[PDB]
Amino acid sequence: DYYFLFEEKFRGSRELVKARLRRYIPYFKGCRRVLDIGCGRGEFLELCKEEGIESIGVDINEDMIKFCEGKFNVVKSDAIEYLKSLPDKYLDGVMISHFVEHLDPERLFELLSLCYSKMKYSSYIVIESPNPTSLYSLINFYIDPTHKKPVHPETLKFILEYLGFRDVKIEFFEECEELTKLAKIDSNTVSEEVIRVINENIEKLNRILFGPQDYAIIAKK
Amino acid sequence: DYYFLFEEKFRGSRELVKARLRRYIPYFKGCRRVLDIGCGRGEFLELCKEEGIESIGVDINEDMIKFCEGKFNVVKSDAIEYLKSLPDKYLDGVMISHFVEHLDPERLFELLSLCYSKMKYSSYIVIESPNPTSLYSLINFYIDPTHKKPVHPETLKFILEYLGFRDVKIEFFEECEELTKLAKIDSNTVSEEVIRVINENIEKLNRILFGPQDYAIIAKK
Amino acid sequence: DYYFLFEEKFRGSRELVKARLRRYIPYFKGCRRVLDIGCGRGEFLELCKEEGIESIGVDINEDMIKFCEGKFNVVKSDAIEYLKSLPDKYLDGVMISHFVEHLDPERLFELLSLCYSKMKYSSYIVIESPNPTSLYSLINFYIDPTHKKPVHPETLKFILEYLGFRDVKIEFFEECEELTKLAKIDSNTVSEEVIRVINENIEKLNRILFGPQDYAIIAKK
């Protein structure tokens, strides 16, 4: 089917994706009400079940749900709507992996606003999305047509900080492979200082051109 | 309140915005009917008052308007609606600062077309918007979720020339800080021919990656 | 009107445009039923007329069709609609030059599936459009307000491979001029490998920043 075949090719296998999600488990260990927004193939739900974490996944796509319903708890719904259908101080944790980029930028404030209200204190929200602050990924953001406009890390940090969240931190992941990045220079005949400045320019070039392809913003309370 | 805090953080303080607008005073010197489209926090209006320049601002934001009315002459209203309500050859000059990137693309032509019709002969029009022709700047263009498509300066120049405006000029401001830009190499030991070509390349790299963050297009009649 | 002056200014002369599409002719030689989608100023029509290749053009623009009807066979209509009015396995070939970016993302798939149906075995389809994998050309992409999201070469390749086309090749054209790109270094006072590595860094830079401005995806069957 279209989207499975699509993700499989440009996102990677479920094993691959699940491997990447491992890093975020510490923020949900032993949680009882973790919401997986836009769960898709249910890679996070599978992980959760494995780590002994209770969670529900939501997804507007009917096929992602047929895909997860058998092993996991999922509700075919619009996230914002589903969030309104929830009591305040309900939710335990919230995972939003590669979802916001697929969301109408106009409704971004309301989503996180609802998350704050439906989350109980000392809870963590994790938002993982493609990094548009590096040319390489920015270019690749256009491969998926269902993508809206790139979602900048700073806009996410600003909104949820404004909403009340604290500890807001930004982490970058999946960097470009060696072959793609520019190479640094060495020499025992060329001026150390000429060498030094050229490499700093290459570090700057590598950061803005071939920087990490993803990022994750984490917040608490 | 949201948008003030947002502007303060990403667009700068009022004092700063006001500072950067002094470059346009020569174009509205002694004018009495200047329209400030998307007046925002009123920085351009505050500048006009100090310069004895009469102007009125318009904005869709009731929050921005409430902030300005007790200070300057503003009117809550869509720009196109306001323009349409003016007689032709009425305005002394027009200022459009960081507005077009928020306007729906299909309404850009009309807006500008109306400016031409409602402007009297000899008047000046200034349009400042974030520069998308430089990477650093193109990335920051996505921080604001209310942004539409990046507005290229050549496209505006085309529209203006087409409407009958003349002496159209595109200038660029808000250069990137040397800390972020790549550095030119100074060297007494390496061949000048080689150093020269490396610095000319750094020059091209800096213009397309760390060039001016803003641009302004100025026209007349 | 607007669009003629606009293309003339930003795309180039009919002469120039004609010169660029000339390389796709071998795919439609001897053909009698080629479909040129979004014929524009009929530069592809004109070429086929010169090669004994029979083809019809379609466009949604009144003025573009008006420009053509004199020397070429064209019809004013939505491309999706024209295709549906044809029998399956009818077309000798399909040319889509600088059109997919002017199209609603959610209709792209329909369009291509229709092309597949309406084409007969072993026919060629060529899709030429702006290349967004190079900074230079994606910046210029925003000059045209009517442009939607950029269309990445890989997305087009995935869609039609999905539909059943094979031998899908992605090619790139219209490199930037030597004066715009970064120049390479050559000297004999500097260590060979220092020069070799800086140059391959330049090669990587020129690729992602000043590379091909156009891409053509070619498929058969």
TrEMBL record, chains A, B, C:
Transmembrane segments: none
Superkingdom of origin organism: Archaea
Name listed for the protein in its UniProt record: Methyltransferase domain-containing protein
Span of the entire protein shown here: 253 to 473 of 473
